[PDB]
Amino acid sequence: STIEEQAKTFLDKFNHEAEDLFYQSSLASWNYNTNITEENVQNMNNAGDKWSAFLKEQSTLAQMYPLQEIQNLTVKLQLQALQQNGSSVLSEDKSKRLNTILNTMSTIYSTGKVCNPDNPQECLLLEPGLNEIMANSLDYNERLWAWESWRSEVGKQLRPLYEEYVVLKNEMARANHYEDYGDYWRGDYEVNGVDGYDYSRGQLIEDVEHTFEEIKPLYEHLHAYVRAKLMNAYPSYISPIGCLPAHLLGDMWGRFWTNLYSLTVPFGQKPNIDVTDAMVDQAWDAQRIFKEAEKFFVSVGLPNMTQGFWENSMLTDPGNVQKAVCHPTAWDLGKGDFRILMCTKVTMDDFLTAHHEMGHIQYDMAYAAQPFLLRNGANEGFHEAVGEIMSLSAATPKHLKSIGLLSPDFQEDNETEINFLLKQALTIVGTLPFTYMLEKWRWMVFKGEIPKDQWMKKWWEMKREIVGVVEPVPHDETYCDPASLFHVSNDYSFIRYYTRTLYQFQFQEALCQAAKHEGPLHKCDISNSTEAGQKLFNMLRLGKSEPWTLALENVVGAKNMNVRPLLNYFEPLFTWLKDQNKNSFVGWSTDWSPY
Template sequence: MQKYCTFALLVATCIGLCSSATNVDIEAKEFIKEASKKYYELYNQIADEVYSSIKDEDDFEEIFNKIENVRKISGGLIEIATDANNFDLSQIKNEETKKAVETLKMSSDLFVLGDDYFASVLLNLAALKELATDKDIDPYLDGTSRPNNGSLAYTPDIQNIFKKSTDPEELKYYWTAWRDANFIWSSVNFFTIVDAIKKAADSFDIPIHAFWYRSFNTGEMLKEMDAVMKDIKEPYQQLHAFVRNELKKKYGGDVIDGNAPIPAHLFSQVLEQAWYEGSVIESYFPFKELPPYDKLVEKFDAKQMMEEAERFYQSLGFDELDEEFKRDRLKLSDDTDNIKNCKADIFDLTPKVYVKYCNSVEFKKFMQNHGYLSQVHYAKEKKNLPSYYFNSYDLEYSVGEAVILSASTPKHLTATGLAKDFAFTDQTLFNRLFRMGIHTLFNIPIYYVHTRVMHDLLGGTIETDEVNKHYWKLMEEYVGVEPPVDREEGAIDFTYKFFLDIEQNMQTKKFVGEVLGYQFYSAFCKKAGQVTELHNCDFYGNLAVGNDLKAMMALGSSKPWKEVLKKVLPYPKLSGDALIEYYTPIFNWAKSQNKESKVKIGWNASKRKVL
């Protein structure tokens, strides 16, 4: 009798628990269905506010009203996140339902900070962007330099100087002056944003690195990046040694030590001059022998450049962009005062993508358009996914990079008739490849260092007063770069790029986008049967490549990251192999030059002091 009562009690308890779990699952499913629909509606309302034109840039009341409207709309997103957080995940039995609730829990992103976001974080982000445009740097005057035309801004004034100057003292002055003028302002705003990111993670009750790498849906992204840095270390050091030796020949041993890291102001010069005349590689690869890239697109206007870029995607089998998008959500930028340095603005958190592109006819913008359209088509392919699967692990950036690599090749430009009047020689091809290599391979380690700084700072392995010393330690170890002068305590020496879209972890996205972009490109070229001369492969018009792409895009984040990558990559992980394959010709050439010149590969410890 006692055994029977015990058994009956267990059955009754089990029924109660099972019924409760079922009810929770049903309730959660109803919630995610309504919340996903509401998510799209709210973010579309935010996009409408942000992307509608401001009639008068100086009308602060209109700007304030827009911000106030976004603040009110964001309350609905916070409500979704709060409701999702109220579910006890341990009571949800269905794994897909549980994942959906976990994702919706973070649907408000930094809006979760509420009024603090609008009263503080937005202002901090705006202040960091203004570091580039504030005219607060006195001109360099040595009796021979350009005349004093008033104070200078980082963009475009100082950037243009780095693109043209061959005076290392002038470059050192501007490198130092901009940082010394802005270190208090940059540090105050930067550390406030860091605290806000930590506070947001606490609000979501998730580990800080899980929040920081949230778009990749993994807190382990740094391990993948570490592997890439090991892959490219040796070839990078060969290219670094060649460039350092050329700088030494140009400026002398008093300016640059042939065994030390490259001073940061000269490293920046090399990067800025990669596509300009006067670079340190000019004697080997003259700028005048490059294709006349801007002339290739001079017959277009800005709209036609976008339409020409769209033809690439249609050649892969993607549907034509619908008229509603082209009429209502594809617009020229309002930034008429900054056409040359304009950057497109894109919103793609829902299927209704908004794009503001630049009214500037130049080859660089033409290629960027190819990249922007990857976000538009990615959204179209996953348009039927609920919001909790709409994230695409930021793979749209890698798709865009692969398309740009193909669209910029001599093979493509010749086949489409854009370069019909220009003959690409072997020397031209190598010239292009070398300049691309400097631009790409010297930036990737910087993206890595920027990621590591934030990773370590957020994780608590370094304190705020150690951040600059840690930054230079990483710059020396991974990039082979040192400060031009000793740096005082409290300095913040990050490049301006470090601060751009920092709340979105843009530097990690840049790293992953570049590396995976080359991996995608290599895979597409093999799919297209082009297995030789990777740097001149064009997969334009290949429907098999388009089918692989659409299969990957359609998944959004409904499958784990590596399963999504399998639709395109046979080995779904970050790897430097495609980068090395692409740039093997210049690595081999630099290695030969280094052997002949008997230069040091790698670098000794920096003698610069960072307090």
């Protein structure tokens, strides 16, 4: 009779018919990643095609059901997530052209080539090539040469195609009643129906700008510190008034500055917090790492693992006996089969990665008692922040000392704390302005606020105004510069990392405050507690059943995106940066150039 019962019946039937297909696709992908053959990839492709066809058919069948007369919030959300048109709004010819463009761009970005002259070939790959070239070099000419050559080789083949790509993206966005593609991306955070906790699409930009306004002082202090260190290191390649060079950031795109910590370490004469020797001396293996991780998670309050997690996961690299990709991914088959695919070895980085994977598995198992359309994170930033907060909390030396890695006799000097804060800021705070600039440029180029003939003109000036990085050589309009990254060249969201970064500090502050702990945040412990674990479990089990605006206050208390936890965390580092940069100049000018 009513439409609600029909909608619920159709949704239950869709879930019951799609759970098996999702499990089969996950099993095929696991068999492919664990055994590189032809039958495995063939079965994986067949399962993916069948899943895509089934999803398209179910979406076409669900589009007949209206969305206004739905009084249930969960049913409305599931219908909105199921009736997604996607690329079906365009014609068949336009769709196949866009698919061919995506495929050729992916192949071009994956192949990679250098082909240096004066040599026979000198044509290396991307990761064993430019990455180690610009990450393990101490010269000014070779890095600039490699950066310019790579950017030119990318532009001369991606400039005529990027225009058609963005045109097709704008057409697909406008065909789905969206004003632009950036609005289509921001619509994931939009919540309707529930009054009192709504969140408009335009409020996200205002919140990001308000957070960036308060992040600006910390970024300016970090830029001044990096400029001072570069002037102390290179006295003829950086000015106290200009911006930082482009090829001296330790990365092809300047996103992560992890390679800069080895050259800008203040107390390099002091030892680090590496516990690799303590692990290799006490006869540690890959199994004991996961055992200690499970002990930590069960002491926090998380339940135990399943009987299939320890008999199906590949915790040991087989080696040359069989091909297997060693890439840490938390696979969720959907039917209680949770397993981690990672070649974990004896390494502190591997320890933190295993902790992150176990946190992801726990987050996935939190909302396991939900329909298929609800067994997923609320947004594209919480699913990774929940896993990263466990790694950020487990990185404290007191936790490793209590477990048994670090010896009890250990000093608590502030030099190691300052070094750790600087290392975290170079990999966390260094990417936020670049992420914001890239996201703003993509939004303004997909909306229409940037002229077509001024893409690079706007890019190279936003790289100097927002970011404190200046290019060492001017580039014309024929070089497709902004599309040199991986996310932009493969249609992947980039603001998700910014949201995850802004939410992980809030989650850490909430978990530290709920554990009845006081004092500094950089050494706050979360284990051996009963209130923080329960407060986290009460929020992780929500999933897509509740809006993120209402779910955020259940673990923290705030109803909006705030940045004050980040300031409270970096205050011990912010004061040190102020004390060290008191005699030096702070800020950068867009007039000076290293030309």
